[PDB]
Amino acid sequence: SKNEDQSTQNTDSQTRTISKNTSTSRTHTSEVHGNAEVHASFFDIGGSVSA
Amino acid sequence: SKNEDQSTQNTDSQTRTISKNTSTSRTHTSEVHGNAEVHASFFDIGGSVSA
């Protein structure tokens, strides 16, 4: 007779997790735009520079 | 008589987890715009190039 001791375990688990969260955020944005423009017509030519 | 030993376990667990978090972020944005334009009228036609 093999003197071996064996065991089986069954387990059930039901978990209810109720969670809260909150947040704020603060953004500070800078920006530097550029522009150039060359216009041309039959007899009218222009140019423009912007920032 | 079956020499088998069985056991049942019941367990209750209440966990209160209070969590803190903080953050910073730093964004650096570049941008290169383009533009072309063709205008046409009864007798007036123009064109424009921008960047």
Side-chain angles (χ1 to χ4, degrees), chain A residues 20-49:
Chain A
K20 184 66 180 297
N21 205 171
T22 192
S23 294
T24 63
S25 297
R26 288 180 63 192
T27 304
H28 290 85
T29 297
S30 69
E31 172 178 356
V32 176
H33 179 74
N35 190 1
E37 186 177 2
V38 175
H39 183 73
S41 180
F42 289 105
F43 295 100
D44 292 331
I45 299 169
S48 296
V49 173

